[PDB]
Amino acid sequence: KISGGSVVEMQGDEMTRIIWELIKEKLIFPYVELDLHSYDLGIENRDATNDQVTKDAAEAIKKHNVGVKCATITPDEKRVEEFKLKQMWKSPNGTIRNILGGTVFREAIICKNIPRLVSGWVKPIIIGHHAYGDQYRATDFVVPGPGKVEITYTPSDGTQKVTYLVHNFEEGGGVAMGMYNQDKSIEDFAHSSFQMALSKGWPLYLSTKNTILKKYDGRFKDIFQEIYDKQYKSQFEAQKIWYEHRLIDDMVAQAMKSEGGFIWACKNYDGDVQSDSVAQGYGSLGMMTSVLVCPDGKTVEAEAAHGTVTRHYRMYQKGQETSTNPIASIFAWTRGLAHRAKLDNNKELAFFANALEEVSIETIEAGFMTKDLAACIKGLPNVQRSDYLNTFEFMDKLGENLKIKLA
Amino acid sequence: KISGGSVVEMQGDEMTRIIWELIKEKLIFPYVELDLHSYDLGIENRDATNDQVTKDAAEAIKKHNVGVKCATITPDEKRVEEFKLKQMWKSPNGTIRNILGGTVFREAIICKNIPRLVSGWVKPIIIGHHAYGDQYRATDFVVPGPGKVEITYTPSDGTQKVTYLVHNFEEGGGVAMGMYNQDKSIEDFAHSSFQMALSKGWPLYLSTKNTILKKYDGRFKDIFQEIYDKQYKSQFEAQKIWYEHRLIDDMVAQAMKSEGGFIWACKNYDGDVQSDSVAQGYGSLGMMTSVLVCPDGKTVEAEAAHGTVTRHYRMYQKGQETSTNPIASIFAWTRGLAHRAKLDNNKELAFFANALEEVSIETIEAGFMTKDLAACIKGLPNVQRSDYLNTFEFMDKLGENLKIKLAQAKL
Ligand SMILES: NC(=O)C1=CN([C@@H]2O[C@H](COP(=O)(O)OP(=O)(O)OC[C@H]3O[C@@H](n4cnc5c(N)ncnc54)[C@H](OP(=O)(O)O)[C@@H]3O)[C@@H](O)[C@H]2O)C=CC1
Ligand SMILES: NC(=O)C1=CN([C@@H]2O[C@H](COP(=O)(O)OP(=O)(O)OC[C@H]3O[C@@H](n4cnc5c(N)ncnc54)[C@H](OP(=O)(O)O)[C@@H]3O)[C@@H](O)[C@H]2O)C=CC1
Ligand SMILES: O=C(O)CCC(=O)C(=O)O
Ligand SMILES: O=C(O)CCC(=O)C(=O)O
Ligand SMILES: [Ca+2]
Ligand SMILES: [Ca+2]
Ligand code: NA
Ligand code: NA
């Protein structure tokens, strides 16, 4: 009945797919009508269309400014045999992120009754990681035997091509890889980082390994520092916050013993990994939001940070009972819809967005939660069946709670 | 007085250099005589020898089979300016690890009175991280403007040349790099991992991102699997343990919520970073061992995993009282000497090494400790001067306790 606007939706795989459908059936569709542009990133369909469906979904997001994505399978060899795939398709996440660009901001979803693994974290940690380039765009290969691996730069302006020696393999083979990043993208990431910091009133840290990657990482470090000095510094001081670069070793240690309450700017690989470390440290991988904010200020893709949860899905196929946390998948929808509402100045969509979220927190805070969350309070071995609901029960319960509150 | 043998010693920088001298002077030299082959990896001395001293140290370690290393500054632009360096020298750790090769095993040092940051870790987590290649021997450069970055392989015979497009820079510039690893080194790293799992009777996890780096990381995953199946699987099933690959994201989450009690094989970068996170989670960076175990099975370099503690050094330079935890540095010596002893079948030195370890734990467990550890107990905002000992005080107390312990043993 509520008029949503246009949303790009990406369907995914395995356990998350199951959950994705439950969320549309019970939390979204009964209450909200949309111009839904649906792309199926299920791995069967991606194989069928030779991954073209993925490039299509990314373009759709540019047009419509808003995307909600279910977790997908990125195939290695086992996966190729499993689904009889054409080939080892690349990560859709990496494909879409590289086309859209921007910064991925992740943040735990906090309930008051859910204890943390790490004692100190009483304030949020917001991770914003660079979406573009590096490992997702890397070229890696097997080195078959002895020989020489080199990397070369040929300037477009006709001046001398430059060649560096990567390694001389003199005994057997191995592996080698090239990767890159772009100044403009890195600039965008710096501004997005400083702006999020000002926005929250929290200090900003950048982590790199510039002592080791002196040129590659030093470039991130320099770009951040240049832009800070020229463009944000006084505004930081005015708010009594700060920016500082830290080596990645020190940062992860610092973060661990911290009391939280900062923005953590990461390179792509570190953002990907440290975001799992942090979600789990607050409680669970089901309790983290993830939004890609594009450089335009306008476009957004929301998702759950975690994967398809194949381990739980395997039980589901064997007919056994499961308890998977859908909270993150649900916030992919509320964050996306929130943004849609703010774009269109849709007063009611915004209301629904925020309702489903407080409904989610309120349900867990009343004592209805999936197995992972009960494990947080009790310790896994002390958890009994009466302590949690299963995937379907819990979805139903949120469903009836949404009913009551919207009514 | 104990006859030590030949040890290759590598001297360092900043706060650890100070602590290094205190350890030698108060814990080692009073009791042990050594054929010390001393290499000064202080940054001034590396700059004066164009870093040749670091390669010499490494070569000395092949020859003598044991090395003990102090934390070193790895310079970036700020350090060049600070020390007026000729160049931004490469990490001595990378240099040494790539010359020797092998697997770096890192583990927390645990005291019964010290709370953890992470609740569940009632057993230890042992990380074995590949010492060779990757980021540490990378070639990286700034791309100054539009143009094409390519990476090429040419076989030794010259019979063929393979060119891969890395990126087409048309817009402006950026950065690019290449990195590499070798199969032999990866096979040695698999072996040490499975052996360490068997040794401890714990399960082994390997982490990669093979879904994203399909050839590079998939090479690691495959070598480990093939080697598991053919050579260690019977044995693993016998002690009722197991081996699995996990994706690095899943693995860090799994470690976080776990009970501990596993071996975690890591790629170079991940090992380097997660070992800090792990040490901190058990309570302190001062409380972790690190030994490079070479594939020859005979050669070892022991070190402190943390850095030079530059921030504590600044205070020291101002005359301000400091409290830096020396435990990891002391254990560089104790692990090195324990291995020298094992090599030489030397029971006096073996006994000494282990005696210095117990003394370290006993002193802390009796409530004498540096500030980081007192913060573990009280919470940083709650700790007062009376709660901890300063750097020299704590060293002097261990010195006393070591004297007692060795005396009681002589009796
Ligand atoms: N599209 C995407 O954004 C992502 C996709 N992937 C893909 O997903 C697939 C599986 O990835 P994988 O590394 O196995 O791990 P997943 O992140 O899917 O899950 C791994 C483990 O994390 C815990 N976990 C994750 N989500 C939940 C949840 N919602 N509720 C409770 N526990 C959860 C579970 O622990 P436990 O088993 O102990 O209960 C689970 O087994 C792979 O194909 C991978 O490529 C991976 C990451 C992100
Ligand atoms: N040689 C080596 O193996 C390594 C060398 N390095 C080099 O060390 C230098 C400094 O690196 P950086 O990352 O800043 O810092 P370090 O790793 O030396 O330490 C940074 C912070 O960690 C805490 N810490 C580390 N060790 C101790 C200790 N033993 N006792 C108490 N606290 C400790 C301190 O926290 P707090 O300030 O909060 O009290 C300290 O400020 C750099 O030049 C780097 O290149 C870095 C890593 C390894
Ligand atoms: O795309 C993938 O295969 C993994 C993505 C991921 O883990 C993430 O985006 O955090
Ligand atoms: O060599 C460096 O600069 C840092 C090394 C390091 O952090 C480590 O060995 O854990
Ligand atoms: Ca991840
Ligand atoms: Ca480290
Ligand atoms: Na499971
Ligand atoms: Na300090």
Instruction: Calculate how far, in angstroms, residue A272's C-alpha sits from the geometric centre of ligand 3.
Output: 7
Using the beta-carbon criterion (under 8 Å), do B214 and A88 form an inter-chain contact? yes
Residue B223 · residue B186 · CB < 8 Å: yes
Using the beta-carbon criterion (under 8 Å), do B149 and A152 form an inter-chain contact? yes
The side-by-side arrangement of strands in the sheet containing B139-143 is A139-143, A174-182, B174-182, B139-143
Structure tokens at B148: 């094409």
Give the method of determination. X-ray
Q: Is the CB of A244 under 6 A from ligand 2?
A: no
Tokens 């730069």: give the residue. Answer: A153
Question: What chain B residue is nearest to A141 in terms of C-alpha separation?
Answer: B215
Q: Is B224 on the interface with A (CB under 8 A)?
A: no
Q: Which residues line ligand 4 (CB under 6 A)?
A: A 211-212, 249; B 74, 91, 93-94, 272, 305
For ligand 3, what atom is nearest to the CA of residue A94? 1
Question: Of B117, B184, B213, which is closest to A140 when you measure between CB atoms?
Answer: B213
Q: Is B405 on the interface with A (CB under 8 A)?
A: no
Q: How many CA atoms lie within 13 A of A34 on its CB side?
A: 25
- Structure resolution, Å: 2.1
Terminal Cα-to-Cα distance of chain A (whole angstroms): 13
Cα dist from A382 to A116, B59, B123, B200, B343, whole Å: 17, 54, 19, 27, 47
The residue contributing the CA closest to ligand 2 atom 47 is B307
Using the beta-carbon criterion (under 8 Å), do A219 and B141 form an inter-chain contact? no
Using the beta-carbon criterion (under 8 Å), do A169 and B182 form an inter-chain contact? yes
Name the minimum distance, in Å, from the CA of B190 to any CA of chain A: 14
Position B200, amino acid: K
Alpha-carbon span A196 to A189, nearest angstrom: 11
DSSP 8-state assignment for residue A214: T
Helices first, then strands: H and E counts in chain A: 15, 14
The side-by-side arrangement of strands in the sheet containing B162-169 is A162-169, A147-155, B147-155, B162-169
Strands of B216-287 (E only): list them.
243-247, 262-266
Name the minimum distance, in Å, from the CA of B9 to any CA of chain A: 24
The domains located in chain A, with CATH, are 1-407 (3.40.718.10)
Containing H/E element for B252?
helix B248-257
Q: Cα–chain-centroid distance for residue B65?
A: 17
For ligand 3, what atom is nearest to the CA of residue A93? 1
Structure tokens at B132: 């060779």
Length of chain B counted residue by residue? 411
Q: What is the DSSP string of A258-312?
A: S---EEEEE-HHHHHHHHHHHHHHHT-TTSEEEEEE-TTSS-EEEEESS---HHH
Name the minimum distance, in Å, from the CA of A149 to any CA of chain B: 4
Alpha-carbon span B87 to B79, nearest angstrom: 10
Using the beta-carbon criterion (under 8 Å), do A173 and B183 form an inter-chain contact? yes
For ligand 1, what atom is nearest to the CA of residue B211? 45
